[PDB]
């Protein structure tokens, strides 16, 4: 999911990888609600894609109208980031230098 | 959220001496550094909300001199310095030491004028408009300065709220004008159960809230 | 030259999905932070959502909770907004701008300067039926003094309409109130216009109203009931 549907990076890299915890700060109150990200979509992007097609998701044939949740699946999934981050749970920054 | 007032709601200010105007916080904006992150806003009628000033002290270059920031702590005051007629409008403060940022009440100023007792009517709806199933009595509060004279609609001696509405022009340029419709709706039925119908109007040169009330028929 | 073109208007639906999209010239985009800021209808101006100058979400509002998205494209200088689950009330003047702070400027990321507000579109978000105008003249009283008469227009869909007086040939005193809405998203207005009370016989009373999208264009009059 996290290749084909969050995003989609070239099989050759040319660079290096870096991540960190960003679990003090990437984290609200008491849970970062504003923050998602894309797993839901019918279609595979081009490596190194800003895709801004934030309409419905829409698996299947249901006219949705606009209309969210009944049939119609929301694009994004949210990031609980609250105090409960452990080791997996925590918001690693990623950064890819090609 | 931060609990943000503005005070005073609405202050009529004279040309010549300044104003202080104050937004009040629930948390020290004080940072690290010790930079509070109050900025003040500006907006005229007809006119998009427009900056006035940055962290009340902390200058950028190219921002008006005439708006002065001070305050310590939670509370911060905006002072008119410089004096003109434009400086009527509506203003804003907002918090950006933490997120989300919100909007205050807001608050409009105006140059003062003499105050006068207003002229008030009143217009009981037309029959063949009572036909349409409702009553829109109408009151007319013309000439009442400042905005402060407050409308009390009494069918009956009722003591109620909603249901009245009260649409007020703009500052007119001649003695500051400000002419006031009152609508009161009621229901068909309710025209024909009752008799008076009663705008009262409360204002400061008024030591008599007039009540103008008329009746069914004449 | 500063400028912010802002799309996405025109009559929708509350509860459908809606893109809106603000294109930025007149400066460098993609180094200052960026603004959404609410304004419903007849009402204030108040703050909706926001961006970095990494192009990363400040958030959402109280009422909007993980439900709108905002995105940068930074190939074309342009700023996306999509809106979803309207209802009567999210209604509002959306209005788009960038921030004053510079990168490597005066810490933090500074996020704050609301400075250059482009023309925010009028997103109409509301449902209601096609109602017929009701124009009525509000008869003049027996009013020395100054006489007071008017014509409201009630009950009518959609909103913009105009009105004139006696084909501008009555100009002073004209103050058209705005119209109040009501629960089922109807309108009601009120021209009242004061006039001299001397001249209750020579004065024809007649108010022209306009509904454009009706093609309304009617020449009424005002006469008291007496």
């Known amino acids: 999911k996290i290749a084909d549907y969050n995003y989609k990076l070239p099989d050759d890299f040319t660079g290096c990888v870096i991540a960190w915890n960003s679990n003090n700060l990437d984290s609200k109150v008491g849970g970062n609600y504003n923050y998602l990200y894309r797993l839901f979509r019918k279609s595979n992007l081009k490596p190194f894609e800003r895709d801004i097609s934030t309409e419905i998701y829409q698996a299947g044939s249901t006219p949705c109208n606009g209309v969210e949740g009944f049939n119609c699946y929301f694009p994004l999934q949210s990031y609980g980031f609250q105090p409960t981050n452990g080791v997996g749970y925590q918001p690693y920054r990623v950064v890819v230098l090609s | 959220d931060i609990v943000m007032t503005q005070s005073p709601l609405s202050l009529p200010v004279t040309p010549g001496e300044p104003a202080s105007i104050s937004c009040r916080s629930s948390?020290?904006?004080?940072?690290?550094?010790?930079?509070?992150?109050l900025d003040w806003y500006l907006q005229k009628p007809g006119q998009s909300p427009q900056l006035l000033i940055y962290l009340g002290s902390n200058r950028a270059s190219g921002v008006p001199d005439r708006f002065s920031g001070s305050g310590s702590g939670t509370d911060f005051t905006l002072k008119i310095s410089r004096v003109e007629a434009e400086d009527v409008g509506v203003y804003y403060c907002?918090?950006?030491?933490?997120?989300?940022?919100?909007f205050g009440p807001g608050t409009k100023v105006d140059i003062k004028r003499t105050v006068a007792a207003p002229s008030v009517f009143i217009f009981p709806p037309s029959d063949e408009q009572l036909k349409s199933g409702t009553a829109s009595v109408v009151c007319l509060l013309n000439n009442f300065y400042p905005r402060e004279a407050k409308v009390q609609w009494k069918v009956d001696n009722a003591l109620q709220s909603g249901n009245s509405q009260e649409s007020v022009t703009e500052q007119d340029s001649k003695d500051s004008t400000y002419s006031l419709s009152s609508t009161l709706t009621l229901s068909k039925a309710d025209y024909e159960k009752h008799k008076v119908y009663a705008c009262e109007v409360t204002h400061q040169g008024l030591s008599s809230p007039v009540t103008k009330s008329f009746n069914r028929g004449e | 030259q500063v400028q912010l073109l802002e799309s996405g208007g025109g009559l929708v639906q509350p509860g459908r999905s809606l893109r809106l999209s603000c294109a930025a010239s007149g400066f460098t985009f993609d180094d200052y932070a960026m603004h959404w800021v609410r304004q419903a209808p007849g009402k204030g101006l108040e703050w909706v959502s926001g961006?970095?100058?990494?192009?990363?979400?400040?958030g959402y509002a109280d009422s909007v909770k993980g439900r709108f998205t905002i995105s940068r494209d930074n190939a074309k200088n342009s700023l996306y907004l999509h809106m979803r689950s309207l209802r009567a009330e999210d209604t509002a003047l959306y209005y788009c701008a960038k921030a004053v702070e510079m990168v490597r400027g005066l810490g933090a990321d500074p996020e704050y300067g609301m400075d250059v507000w482009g023309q925010g579109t009028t997103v109409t978000v509301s449902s209601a039926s096609t109602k017929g105008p009701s124009v009525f003249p509000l008869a003049p009283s027996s009013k020395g003094g100054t006489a007071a008469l008017g014509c409201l227009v009630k009950d009518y869909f959609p909103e913009p309409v105009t009105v004139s007086w006696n084909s501008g040939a009555l100009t002073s005193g004209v103050h058209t109130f705005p119209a109040v809405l009501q629960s089922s998203g109807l309108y009601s207005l009120s021209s009242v216009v004061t006039v001299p009370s001397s001249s209750l016989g020579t004065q024809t009373y007649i108010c022209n109203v306009n509904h454009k999208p009706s093609n309304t264009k009617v020449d009424k009059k005002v006469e008291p009931k007496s």
């Open positions: 948390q020290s904006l004080l940072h690290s550094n010790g930079y509070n992150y």
């Open positions: 961006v970095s100058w990494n192009s990363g979400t400040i």
């Open positions: 907002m918090q950006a030491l933490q997120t989300p940022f919100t």
